[PDB]
Design a protein around this ligand. Structure first.
Ligand SMILES: COc1ccc2[nH]c(C(=O)NS(=O)(=O)c3ccc(C)cn3)cc2c1
Ligand SMILES: COc1ccc2[nH]c(C(=O)NS(=O)(=O)c3ccc(C)cn3)cc2c1
Ligand SMILES: COc1ccc2[nH]c(C(=O)NS(=O)(=O)c3ccc(C)cn3)cc2c1
Lengths: 278, 286
């Protein structure tokens, strides 16, 4: 009956889905606005940008989930220290068994977008992501949930989940945090050797070049991006695609998104950027 | 939108029922949902009455013939639709909200993100109908998200559906209680169904065999599972023009576990072109 212990202004850590559900419900009834930032731990500046965006909302209480979904790199104590330093009041750290007490059973089947782009090499990846995101949304019942624009296809699929299942949450996409030279933040970046790390800037350089080339039209944008990637050694491009903002076919003019994925040695990198045609 | 207590308020827009439901919840009323495909009968009304019994309840009945749980072959067009009787019945029952969405409002983007049920969906009713339960679970998930009820009510008649809905609720961590309501029957035992209207007089007479076989089995079960099944089979075999599709005795969760002391016996049979379902609790031994 009693609500689990919660101490305002401190980092409260809960591993039981029931506990965070009860605390979240109690906080909502005290008027606070529950913000959710889902992560897979091993926190970096990208995740912290999500946290800071959530904190800006007046009356916010921020819930950061840390869960490695086996269905879709673990430094527990440093993660929590970072969150404490950011003023996060709730960390939700469940086990696989807690999230999946009956094993894999009912799941989310995404639409056809999930088979495209990243879903090429990993046809079940987004099913896993949308299943765990749905569950976190139901457990926490946040007013808003924050995702990076980094994993843009993921973000679009989440927006499809929310629309399709009539979820009441607001989905907030946060602009990608980048290193000084433009490389999109990722825990994978540290795996690159110096030659690879130098070559890796070509992804962001190609995309930014395309965004500015776009005054000259879609083909000029695509060709500019390809030219930049073509100037990099050891960058195996998996795709470079200009789509509309919802990842359907790019319209003749208007707003779109340019997405790229590439392999450097054994490391796969992704990037994307807003494009306006003409 | 407006809401008038003690009267039947009908909303077609998901946003209207969502706003009204949330407002009611925030003023302390508990919201009950009874999801139906219309063509209401006393079985549906038993759900409504159970919902009404919850103190401080406001009852939302949804009526939507969900196109996603039908396959090609004319079944969708053939489903009974009795809009005027349905609403008249809800008024008579004191129901305050009817949610009657359009297909376009529910599926503005057609088939996109859906619910994939677990392996139970490929058995029994789902065996020859591979996407049927995905269709059911998808619309039920949407209705639950639109209405955000405290409790949602289902009949035990569609027992497999009920079990799958409990799976949906558990697996997606949904904050709703699922209430299963025992099957309402005609005087002779025939389970209530919107399909009973498709039995001619001879078929109606023969149709008592399903409930007779199940109830016989439930009492035969003191002598074990074989006795129970064989009693049911005998009754079905003695019935003119009953073509059995399946008769299965399973664990109560219909899941990947063997029968213990508590089981469910399920039957599906055809009388002419009309497919009827029934099921009953079984206790094995004494
Ligand atoms: C705001 O600028 C940024 C920049 C980069 C970012 N990376 C992530 C991130 O990785 N989040 S995660 O840990 O939940 C995860 C892990 C694996 C897969 C496939 C998708 N997501 C967020 C983020 C935000
Ligand atoms: C409490 O006693 C009873 C007895 C019989 C009943 N039938 C229904 C019923 O039909 N509900 S439905 O409209 O959601 C539906 C229609 C078709 C399919 C396949 C599954 N579900 C409820 C009910 C309750
Ligand atoms: C031949 O036996 C099978 C076995 C499994 C199957 N899965 C699908 C399937 O999923 N199709 S879908 O993605 O277009 C879809 C999903 C959900 C809803 C409700 C309707 N359609 C078809 C199918 C056929």
């Amino acid at each position: 009956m009693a609500i689990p212990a919660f101490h305002p202004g401190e980092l409260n850590v809960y591993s039981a889905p029931g506990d965070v559900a009860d605390v979240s419900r109690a906080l909502r009834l005290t008027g606070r606005r529950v913000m959710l930032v889902p992560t897979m731990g091993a926190l970096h500046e990208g995740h912290l940008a999500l946290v800071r965006a959530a904190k800006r909302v007046p009356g916010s209480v921020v819930v950061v989930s840390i869960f490695v979904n086996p269905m879709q790199p673990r430094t527990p104590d440093d993660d929590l220290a970072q969150l404490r330093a950011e003023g996060v009041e709730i960390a939700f750290t469940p086990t696989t068994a807690a999230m999946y007490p009956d094993g894999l059973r009912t799941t989310v089947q995404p639409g056809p977008l999930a088979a495209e782009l990243e879903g090429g090499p990993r046809p079940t990846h987004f099913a896993g992501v949308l299943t765990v995101v749905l569950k976190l949304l139901q457990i926490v019942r946040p007013d808003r949930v924050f995702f990076g624009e980094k994993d843009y296809q993921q973000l679009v699929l989440i927006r499809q989940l929310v629309a399709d299942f009539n979820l009441d949450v607001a989905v907030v996409g946060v602009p990608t945090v980048r290193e000084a030279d433009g490389l999109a933040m990722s825990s994978r970046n540290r795996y690159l050797d110096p030659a690879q790390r130098a070559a890796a800037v070509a992804l962001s350089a190609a995309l930014t070049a395309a965004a500015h080339a776009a005054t000259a039209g879609a083909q000029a944008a695509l060709d500019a991006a390809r030219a930049v990637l073509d100037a990099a050694p050891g960058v195996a491009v998996d795709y470079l695609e200009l789509r509309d903002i919802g990842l359907g076919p790019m319209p003749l003019n208007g707003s779109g998104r340019l997405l790229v994925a590439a392999r450097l040695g054994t490391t796969r990198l992704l990037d994307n950027i807003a494009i306006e045609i003409g």
